[PDB]
């Protein structure tokens, strides 16, 4: 009975791959080779935010593209001002072990979570003049891979017990638990319209969840090993995916399958963060070959090399304005490229 | 030239820099210790001997110097994705129970865990303070039950000291590197201060060898 159900699951899986094989008429390289190439991309470190005293693990911009939050393993997260390199805040955390951080789109709140299993929330716009913890979000029993703000009252997370969740910050209770991964999740990427999002895990399976309803819609495979980084394409109809296989692979949401492969013979190392540009033409991948590479997202050429840091690039992020590209790393130096 | 408000923002940035460098010195003059091991293997015994829900810190001081102990075994996920948070830990305190040689292959599981942590790409330099716990129950269990069931290819005496030496020599043989770090093995007592004294003696030897390596002598 249950083995009949195993055979039924395999029949459904073969049906799914048969359908998405029927839908593949021509790959991306046949369409987008007529387009002239982007030319060589050269960028210099226009700033350097030397404040942290340990390996930094995360970084998120503001929606004004001037403030950026940056968390590190020394117990601090520091809200730089990207233009003047000024520390507008430095928030003492309660536990030093911090895997992720996020900056709310209002600019009123930040979040951070690590091995403490708690995505704590800090109120930046206080009347008492200091930052302070607004809500301690518990109940998640694994390290936090990522936190993102939807509104000032809604936050999704990405755990170590293979689940994602959705909180209401005012109540403190998780509304909609997202179960369905097998290995624990490693990234998370809200859509521009925030109706849905994409999360990645140790299954090498990116899944297209749905925020309002609460169930997975599409499951994407195609990486050999674990994936560490997902960023939506700016149209909201695709997303790239960075893995431990030295391969970035942008998937499609409409066509439900893998579209392009980004790999090179001289790189074998893992990928820690990806993010697109504003138009979407070039995606920026953060390797632990100590440097970020710049991939033409349509013709799959490595357009440029960002060789600033002297250890593992653990986080990178692109301004919503599309002007600057910050890259953080384990040598405690946020470089801001342009 | 800065404005009247940009100057006060830059003074805020510099006073924050001052509090950061002070707190970084306060943190860097401090000794951090990782705890590893399978469950019911005397980790609670060692933590109880020191002071007398994902990560668990036990913070104690000794010789006017602070010690941080990270009982990391509470939370369960993939160790491949957060153990790189712990490079720069001064000494890993790995804990094995001796009496788990026949229970279900717990000793072979602890040997695999010790191998995966000792030969790790992050813990290349970090030495290991190995403990072997519950030795008297081990004496009872080897006077009753044999020793081929844990490790198959061994033939020797069913005495405590020789079998304990064979377990110690099987654990300390897993390090593929010995020029870089050094395993400090101890057999725990019932309850005594020799436990915590061996921890600080091992930590002292580690700090002296790091200082010798940094001063250019070693």
């Amino acid at each position, epitope marked *: 009975e249950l083995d009949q159900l195993r055979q039924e699951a395999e029949q459904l899986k073969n049906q799914i791959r048969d359908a998405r094989k029927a839908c593949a008429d021509a790959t991306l390289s046949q369409i987008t080779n007529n387009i002239d190439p982007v030319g060589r991309i050269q960028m210099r470190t226009r700033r350097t935010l030397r404040g942290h005293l340990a390996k930094i693990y995360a970084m998120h911009w503001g929606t004004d593209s*001037r*403030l950026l939050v940056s968390a590190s393993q020394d117990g601090k997260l520091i809200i730089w*001002d990207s233009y*003047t390199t*000024n520390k*507008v*805040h430095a928030i003492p955390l309660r536990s030093s072990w911090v895997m992720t951080c996020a900056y709310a789109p209002s600019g009123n709140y930040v979040a951070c979570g690590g091995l403490d299993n708690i995505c704590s929330i800090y109120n930046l*716009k206080t*009347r*008492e*003049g*200091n930052v302070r913890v607004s809500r301690e979000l518990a109940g998640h029993t694994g390290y936090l891979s990522c936190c993102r703000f939807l509104d000032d009252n809604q936050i999704v997370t990405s755990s170590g017990d293979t689940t994602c969740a959705l909180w209401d910050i005012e109540t403190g209770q998780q509304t909609t638990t997202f179960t369905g991964h097998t290995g624990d999740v490693m990234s998370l990427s809200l859509a521009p319209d925030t109706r849905l999002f994409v999360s990645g895990a140790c299954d090498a399976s990116a899944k297209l969840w749905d925020v309002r309803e609460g169930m997975c819609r599409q499951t994407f495979t195609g990486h050999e090993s674990d994936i560490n980084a997902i960023c939506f394409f700016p149209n909201g109809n695709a997303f790239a995916t960075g893995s431990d296989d030295a391969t970035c692979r942008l998937f499609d949401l409409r066509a439900d399958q893998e579209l392009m492969t980004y790999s090179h013979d001289n790189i074998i190392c893992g990928i820690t963060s990806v993010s697109f540009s504003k138009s979407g033409r070039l995606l920026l991948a953060g390797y632990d070959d100590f440097n970020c590479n710049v991939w033409d997202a349509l013709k799959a050429d490595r357009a440029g090399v960002l060789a600033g840091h002297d250890n593992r690039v653990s986080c990178l992020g692109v301004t919503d304005d599309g002007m600057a590209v910050a890259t953080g790393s384990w040598d405690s130096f946020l470089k801001i490229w342009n | 030239t800065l*404005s*009247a*408000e*940009d*100057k*006060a*923002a830059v*003074e*805020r940035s510099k*006073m924050i820099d001052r509090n950061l460098r002070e707190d970084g010195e306060k943190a860097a003059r401090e000794v951090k210790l990782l705890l590893l091991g399978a469950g019911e293997s005397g980790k609670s015994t060692i933590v109880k001997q020191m002071k007398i829900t994902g990560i668990v810190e036990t913070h104690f001081t000794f010789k006017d110097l602070h010690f941080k102990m990270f009982d990391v075994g509470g939370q369960r996920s993939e160790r491949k994705k957060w153990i790189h948070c712990f490079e720069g830990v001064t000494a890993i305190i790995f804990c094995v129970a001796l009496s788990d040689y026949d229970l279900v292959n717990r000793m072979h599981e602890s040997m695999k865990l010790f191998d995966s942590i000792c030969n790790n790409k992050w813990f290349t330099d970090t030495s290991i303070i190995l403990f072997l716990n519950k030795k008297d129950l081990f004496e009872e269990k080897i006077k009753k039950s044999p020793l081929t069931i844990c490790y198959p290819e061994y033939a020797g005496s069913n005495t405590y000291e020789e079998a304990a030496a064979y377990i110690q020599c099987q654990f300390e043989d897993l390090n593929k590197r010995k020029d870089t770090k050094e395993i400090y093995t101890h057999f725990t007592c019932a309850t005594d201060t020799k436990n915590v004294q061996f921890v600080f003696d091992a930590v002292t030897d580690v700090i002296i060898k790091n200082n010798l390596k940094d001063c250019g002598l070693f």
Partner: single-chain antibody
Amino acid sequence: VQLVESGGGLVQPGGSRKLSCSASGFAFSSFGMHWVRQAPEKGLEWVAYISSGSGTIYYADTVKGRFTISRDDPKNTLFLQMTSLRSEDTAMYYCVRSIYYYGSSPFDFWGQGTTLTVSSDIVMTQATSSVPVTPGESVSISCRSSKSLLHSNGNTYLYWFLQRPGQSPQLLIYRMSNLASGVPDRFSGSGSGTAFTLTISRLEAEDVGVYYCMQHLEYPLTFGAGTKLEL
């Protein structure tokens, strides 16, 4: 939050006096403080300043040398040491708390004040000193600067204050455009360099007082004279 001053009373001229402002309900050590004085039937006027950590002190030229400002961070207390008191030093002295980073609202909270009775700047021009107001009508109040307040970094440093009869003045619009927290959005500010406009829409009851414009581009901080609303 609560800033409470002490050290009033009549003092013979030429003498000395120390003022004490006791702060409550906020992290005192992060804020740069201020003293602003008000002659008893005249406008507001700036006295002194400390930054955070006591790192930077400025004075107005009329009190430079005779007054010494200091702060006590572990007891949350702001001090003003006054000596050689003159006739112009008879005023109402307020204590103002202000914080400076990217996007803060300095001069946000003003203390109750205290009355003490003794027996090349940028000059700000009020257009009008008194204006009749119908309730429910839009009111436009102008200010004018002797020097252009548009700095090269995009920010023009014009603030707006409103003093109720018998109360401390409160911040309405900081940095020419940005509404303060807890301030209803009837108020609206605009303009350009050296020419400025406060706009109220549908003026209401208990919103009638004296309005001030203040530049903050350079020290000393010279306010305006004070345009008053009446019915």
